[PDB]
């Protein structure tokens, strides 16, 4: 009966769905090879705004490894080596592979997916 939940959903069942201040995450995002006005990044923020609270939580788990919201805000987001901001990296491999996450750095590697729809499908399939 518990096996109906995913490894995400059991956490969301025990501790509940968080309310994600997408503005706080955006305020605490670092862009390395993308830029803040890249079209794939505007698609990323549009997608993440379009995801419901549960798919947002699954994204947060995908990139940070947890759904827990920091009391002080995502400025206080910890990583392996102290406070690590969330971060989006362009994955220069082929764009027929999913984004990939390294949660101890809170690191997203993101291929330069050609479209909003395809990027959204791949992200939703990852989470």
């Amino acid at each position: 009966l518990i096996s109906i939940f995913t490894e995400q959903e059991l956490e969301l069942l025990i501790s509940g769905l968080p309310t994600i201040d997408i503005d706080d995450l955006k305020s605490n995002t670092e862009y390395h090879k993308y830029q803040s006005n890249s079209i794939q990044i505007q698609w990323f923020w549009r997608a993440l705004r379009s995801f419901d609270q549960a798919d947002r939580a699954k994204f947060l788990q995908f990139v940070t490894g947890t759904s827990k919201v920091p009391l002080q805000g995502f400025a206080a987001l910890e990583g392996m080596n102290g406070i690590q901001k969330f971060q989006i990296h362009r994955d220069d491999r082929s764009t027929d592979r999913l984004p990939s996450a390294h949660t101890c750095f809170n690191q997203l590697d993101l291929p330069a997916y050609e479209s909003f729809e395809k990027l959204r499908h791949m992200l939703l399939l990852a989470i």
Binding site: L1, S3, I4, F5, E9, L13, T66, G79, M80, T103
Partner: protein, 446 residues
């Protein structure tokens, strides 16, 4: 022979006069007691059935039938019942026949005025006759009657038309009739199955015609909320969707219909509803989806369906209050990626309450000290049974004032979930990498 046929005729004339005060249940119990005598019963029933057939001065009974029309129930010139009064004579006779089923007359009647299993065939023919076939009430009563009595080909066609045409209780009694008939003979079973399939195929053909108009009109709506008038004949309470699903539920009840031109166009229709950025717009096909998962997903194609329409089937389930594991969509319990989290949460909570529904849950006290709650709870509970744990806990802190038990329980859970991660118990330790998560402390052997 307690009573003669003239005294029975005098009693039976009471069935025609519609007086609200008259106690017709008491009259039914008089006829029931009289009908313990087999010859009286047989004459009584032959008269009541002649009254039904003839529905389809002492005898001057004026019934108000319509506006400005006060009819005489009897026209004597060979005695006929004025069709305005007929539906009431039918209603009172079926009311009496339902009790006798739980357990010449005209010439005698004019002589006054001048001063189970065999007739089941007549009662099945009765469904064709207009005063009955019109009235949903008389049909429901006659079907309840047949459903009691049941404990040929045209007569089954007329029984099935009761489902293919217009009463949820009367059509569930028709389902009972068709079952209890099928219990009789493999040949009537087969003929009723094949004539159900024939009617369901007609319904499917016209449903594909209706959805083809719907899809076309959604094309014409997009290509330049949803109130397409083609939708009205699917919303309708008497829609072919509800007839088709009803018939399929009876087919599936008798099993213990090849329409891929329907199923694939229901498919592309759903896909064009979902792409049209409206949500409840799907629900006008919910019974067609439930029919799909009835005919398919036999106690696969439904899995390809649940993939390509996943979020749609989720909109269906999320809107439906039908409990996931009692409705048709229970099969997908095991293919769990095809449901939303909160749908699975609802199913979870309903199945948990269903499995533990036999258990009465009580309230249960827990006496703890604010400084020792964790170990006091361990001592109190660690030998308790699961069903004693399932009782509702209220927590009393020693010497503290009374407070809301819900807030005090939330505090108790919060304090416990904290103390779990106190290193003094050595239960959980933070991942040295993340430093905010927690996993089993490999140093709890201390």
């Amino acid at each position: 022979l307690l009573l003669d046929h003239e005294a029975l005729s005098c009693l039976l004339v009471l069935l025609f006069v519609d007086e609200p005060k008259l106690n017709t249940s008491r009259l039914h119990r008089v006829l029931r007691n009289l009908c313990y005598h087999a010859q009286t019963r047989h004459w009584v029933i032959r008269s009541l059935l002649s009254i039904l057939q003839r529905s389809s001065s002492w005898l001057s009974v004026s019934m108000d039938a319509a506006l400005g029309c006060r009819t005489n129930i009897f026209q004597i010139q060979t005695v006929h019942i004025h069709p305005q009064a007929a539906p009431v004579v039918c209603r009172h006779v079926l009311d009496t026949l339902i009790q006798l089923a739980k357990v010449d007359f005209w010439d005698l009647l004019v002589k006054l005025d001048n001063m189970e299993a065999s007739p089941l065939g007549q009662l099945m023919n009765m469904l064709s006759h207009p005063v009955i076939r019109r009235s949903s009430l008389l049909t429901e009563k006659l079907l309840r009657l047949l459903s009691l009595i049941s404990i040929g080909l045209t007569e089954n066609q007329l029984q099935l038309s009761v489902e293919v045409l217009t009463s949820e209780e009367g059509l569930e009694d028709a389902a009972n009739v068709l079952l209890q008939l099928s219990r009789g003979d493999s040949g009537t079973r087969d003929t009723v199955l094949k004539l159900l399939l024939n009617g369901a195929r007609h319904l499917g053909y016209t449903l594909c015609k209706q959805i083809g108009t719907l899809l076309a009109e959604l094309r014409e709506y997009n290509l330049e909320e949803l109130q397409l008038p083609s939708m009205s004949m699917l919303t309708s309470k008497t829609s072919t969707q509800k007839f088709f699903l009803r018939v399929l539920q009876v087919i599936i009840q008798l099993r213990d219909l090849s329409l891929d031109e329907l199923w694939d166009m229901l498919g592309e229709c759903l896909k064009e509803l979902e792409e049209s950025h409206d949500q409840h717009a799907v629900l006008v096909l919910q019974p067609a989806v439930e029919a799909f998962f009835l005919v398919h997903a036999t106690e696969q194609k439904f899995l390809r369906f649940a993939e390509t329409h996943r979020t749609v089937l989720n909109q269906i389930l999320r809107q439906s209050t039908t409990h996931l594991a009692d409705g048709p969509f229970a099969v997908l319990v095991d293919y769990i990626r095809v449901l939303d989290f909160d749908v699975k949460r609802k199913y979870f909570r309903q199945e948990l309450e269903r499995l533990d529904e036999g258990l009465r849950k009580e309230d249960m006290a827990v006496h703890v000290r604010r400084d020792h709650v964790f170990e006091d709870s361990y001592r109190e509970l660690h030998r308790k049974s699961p069903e004693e744990m399932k009782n509702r806990l209220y927590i009393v802190f020693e010497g503290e004032e009374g407070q809301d038990a819900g807030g005090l329980l939330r505090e108790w859970y919060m304090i416990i979930s904290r103390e779990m991660f106190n290193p003094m118990y050595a239960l959980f330790r933070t991942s040295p990498g993340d430093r905010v998560t927690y996993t089993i402390n490999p140093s709890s052997h201390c």
